Design a protein around this ligand. Structure first.
Ligand SMILES: N[C@@H](CCC(=O)N[C@@H](CS)C(=O)NCC(=O)O)C(=O)O
Ligand SMILES: N[C@@H](CCC(=O)N[C@@H](CS)C(=O)NCC(=O)O)C(=O)O
Ligand SMILES: O=C[C@H](O)[C@@H](O)[C@H](O)[C@H](O)CO
Ligand SMILES: O=C[C@H](O)[C@@H](O)[C@H](O)[C@H](O)CO
Lengths: 197, 204
C-alpha cells in the first residue's frame, strides 16, 4: 500500500524524474515543494538535496534510487526491464548518464567558466547519443523505460541551459518530443517548468 | 553460466567481483589482467579502460557494483541484496554512499600516479580514515554491515579494509570494532579463495 511523499524542487530536474515516475505509475502520492529549505531536509538527506522520498520509516534520496524503489513497489508500467541481462545493461546506461551528462547538469544547477565547459560536454555527449533515435522510438527501443525518464529533464531544459546542438541532433529532438507528449509527463510538469519551453 | 571476469590482480574493485563469484560457488573464468601493461581490448570492452569487466555471451558489463548486482540476480544464492524492496532500497543507497564517501578516494589512490598525485593521495587517506572511523561503532552490535547476514555491503567495502596497511591508512584505537568486523569478513573461506597471490602479500 502506497504512502509516498516526495520532497521536490519545483524546477529541479532530478525531482522531475521522480515526479515523472510517480505520475507514470498512477498510484497515490503527495508532492511537497521545497524552496531552496526547511531544516528537516538536511535531517532526512545529509547531502541537503531534493528529491527525497518518504514512505513510512523509509527515507530515500538520489533520484535513480528513489525511482528504482518506486518501480519495484508498483511494477506497472515496468520501467526497469524484467530480464536480468537487459536490466543490467540499462543500469549501466543509467550510471553512464550520471557520469557523462548529469554531473554537468549539477554544475549548471548548483554552482561560471565551468558552466561553459558543462554546456559543451552536454552538447558533445548528446551528439554521440543522437544516432540511436534514427531507428529507436525510445532509448531501449519500443518500450518506454527509466532511461527516457532519466534524460528527459535534461532534454527539456536544453534551451533553458543555453545548449546548442550539432546538426546530427534532429532525431534526438523528435525522440524528446515523444517523451514530452506522454500524459504522465504533461501531468508531472510544474508551472515553473512549463515556462522553460 | 559462461561468465568471464576480467580482473585486476590487485584491483580492489575486481576483488569485489571475485569475492561475489566465490561466495556463489558458480562456474566462472577469471582472466587476470596486468594493469602495468594493460591490453588494448580492455579499452574496447570498457571505454573507460578499466577493470573489472564481466563478459557473458553477448553481454559486456563493467563497474563492479553493476556486475555484482547482475550476478546476484542471476544466481541468488546466497542473496547479497535484500529481497524486501524497502531493505533493498536502503542497501542500494548505502552502496552509493560508499562509492561517494570512500571509493572515490580509493580510485584516487589506485589510478592517480606520480609525484603530482601525492597531495591527492594524502587527502584520499585522510578522508578514508575519517569516514571509516565514523562507521566503526556500527560493528559493536552488528556482525556484518546489515546485521546478522552477510550482504553486498560487506562485499563492497572489504577490499578497502583489506588494504588499509597497503594504503598507509592508520586508524585510531576506537576503530577496533571495524577491524573485528573486517576479520569476520576475511576469515570467510570464499574471501580467502578470492584473494590473488599478490593481494595475500598485502597484509603483514
Ligand atoms: N544525485 C542527486 C542530485 C540531486 C540534486 O542535486 N538536487 C539539487 C536540485 S537540482 C539540490 O537539491 N541542491 C540525484 O540524482 O537525485
Ligand atoms: N567504478 C569502477 C572503478 C574501477 C577502476 O577504477 N579500476 C582500476 C583499477 S583499481 C582500473 O582499471 N584503472 C585502469 C587504468 O588506469 O589502467 C568499478 O567499481 O568497477
Ligand atoms: O501535488 C501533490 C499532490 O499531492 C498530487 O500529486 C496528488 O496527491 C496526486 O496526484 C495523487 O494522485
Ligand atoms: O545502522 C546501521 C546501518 O547499517 C547503516 O548505518 C549502514 O551500516 C551504513 O552503511 C553506514 O552509514
Amino acid at each position: 500500500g502506497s504512502m509516498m511523499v516526495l520532497y521536490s524542487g519545483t524546477t529541479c530536474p532530478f525531482s522531475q524524474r521522480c515526479r515523472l515516475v510517480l505520475f507514470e505509475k498512477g498510484m497515490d502520492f503527495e508532492i511537497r515543494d521545497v524552496d531552496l529549505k526547511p531544516e528537516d531536509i538536511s535531517v532526512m538527506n545529509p547531502y541537503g538535496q531534493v528529491p527525497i522520498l518518504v514512505e513510512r520509516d523509509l527515507i530515500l534520496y538520489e533520484s535513480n534510487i528513489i525511482n528504482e524503489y518506486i518501480d519495484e513497489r508498483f511494477p506497472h508500467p515496468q520501467l526497469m526491464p524484467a530480464d536480468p541481462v537487459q536490466r543490467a545493461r540499462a543500469r549501466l546506461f543509467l550510471l553512464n548518464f550520471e557520469k557523462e551528462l548529469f554531473v554537468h547538469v549539477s554544475t549548471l544547477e548548483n554552482e561560471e567558466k565551468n558552466h561553459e565547459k558543462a554546456r559543451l560536454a552536454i552538447r558533445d555527449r548528446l551528439t554521440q547519443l543522437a544516432p540511436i533515435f534514427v531507428k529507436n522510438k525510445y532509448m531501449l527501443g519500443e518500450e518506454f523505460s527509466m532511461l527516457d525518464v532519466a534524460i528527459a529533464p535534461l532534454l527539456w531544459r536544453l534551451d533553458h541551459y543555453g545548449i546548442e546542438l550539432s546538426k546530427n541532433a534532429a532525431p534526438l529532438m523528435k525522440y524528446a518530443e515523444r517523451i514530452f507528449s506522454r500524459p504522465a509527463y504533461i501531468e508531472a510538469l510544474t508551472p515553473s517548468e512549463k515556462v522553460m519551453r
